[PDB]
Amino acid sequence: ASTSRLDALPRVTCPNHPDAILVEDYRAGDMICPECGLVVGDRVIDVGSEWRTFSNDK
Ligand SMILES: [Zn+2]
């Protein structure tokens, strides 16, 4: 599918470390590897435009 540029968002484990999987923080920590000690995902997709609520009362 040429229309699709890139879909593989999540990286399955570390390319240079199969046994070691890039761990993830709770928020604003990114994903680091316990081997090569890398840090993937420094940015933070902040798209506030969905309201986010438990349905309106009225
Ligand atoms: Zn690694």
Curated annotation (Swiss-Prot):
- Name the positions where DNA binds: R52
Give compartment(s): Nucleus; Chromosome
- Expression sites (tissue/organ): Expressed in the inner cell mass forming the embryoblast. Not detected in cells from the outer thin layer trophoblast (at protein level).
Zn finger region (TFIIB-type): 10-41
Q: How is it modified after translation?
A: Acetylated.
Q: Per UniProt, where does Zn(2+) bind?
A: C14, H17, C33, C36
Q: Any domain commentary? A: The TFIIB-type zinc-binding domain is necessary for the interaction and recruitment of RNA polymerase II to the core promoter, the formation of a fully competent pre-initiation complex (PIC) assembly and basal transcription initiation. The C-terminus is necessary and sufficient for interaction with the TATA box-bound TBP complex and for the formation of PIC.
The family classification in the record reads: Belongs to the TFIIB family.
Q: What does this protein do?
A: General transcription factor that plays a role in transcription initiation by RNA polymerase II (Pol II). Involved in the pre-initiation complex (PIC) formation and Pol II recruitment at promoter DNA. Together with the TATA box-bound TBP forms the core initiation complex and provides a bridge between TBP and the Pol II-TFIIF complex. Released from the PIC early following the onset of transcription during the initiation and elongation transition and reassociates with TBP during the next transcription cycle. Associates with chromatin to core promoter-specific regions.
Q: How does it assemble?
A: Found in a ternary complex with TATA box-bound TBP. Part of a TFIID-containing RNA polymerase II pre-initiation complex (PIC) that is composed of TBP and at least GTF2A1, GTF2A2, GTF2E1, GTF2E2, GTF2F1, GTF2H2, GTF2H3, GTF2H4, GTF2H5, GTF2B, TCEA1, ERCC2, ERCC3, TAF1, TAF2, TAF3, TAF4, TAF5, TAF6, TAF7, TAF8, TAF9, TAF10, TAF11, TAF12 and TAF13. Associates with TFIID-TFIIA (DA complex) to form TFIID-TFIIA-TFIIB (DAB complex), which is then recognized by RNA polymerase II (Pol II). Found in a RNA polymerase II initiation complex. (Microbial infection) Interacts with HIV-1 Vpr.
UniProt-recorded name of the protein: Transcription initiation factor IIB
Annotated source species: Homo sapiens (Human)
Per the record, the gene is GTF2B
